[PDB]
Structure 1
């Protein structure tokens, strides 16, 4: 898939967490988010489509997705312990990175 489909998947699952009721929906949505971030790691953002795949910008893109993946791991650890409200609070932080990375690499 392209980078934009993965962006849309992240946003949709973030809203799903925003509306979630129990811990299972949070776990499933954050797992889908992890998968979408791993997939987006293989994509080229539009702003970097004219750049070397070996450029430092591509490296920084991928390592930023690594940082996001580790924050997602933290949120998933919170959700696996049944912490619904804290998983949602942590996901509210994920949003400020997902939308930001969206606004820059657009």
Structure 2
């Protein structure tokens, strides 16, 4: 999918995590977020459509999605241990990263 639709997916699943009731729901949401972030890593965001795929700006963009992938992993590790509240709290900081990426690259 294109970058904007991947970003929609990330936001939708953040809402899911915020309102989630059990560890299975959080883990499902976070797995969908990981897939969307990995797919967005192959995309070009609107702000960088005037940059080449191997420009420093596009390399920095892809590293930004690596960073997000590791933050998703932290929440997912919490959810695998049954720590639903701690995973939701970790997802609070995912929202910060996602919002900043939206503002930076749209």
TM-score relative to the length of structure 2 = 0.98
* Segments of 4+ moved more than 6 angstroms: none
Distance 1:51 1:38 in 2: 20
Partner of 2:25: 25
**Deviations 1:46-94 (CA, angstroms, capped at 9, x unpaired):** 0000111111010000011001101111110000000000000000000
Distance 1:25 1:94 in 2: 17
Q: How far did 1:39 drift?
A: 0.3
- Which stretch has the larger CA shift, 6-15 or 50-59? 50-59
TM-score relative to the length of structure 1 = 0.98
Distance 1:30 1:54 in 2: 29
The number of residues matched between the two structures is: 106
Note the residue ranges of structure 2 that are not aligned, 5 or more in a row. none
Distance 2:5 2:48 in 1: 17
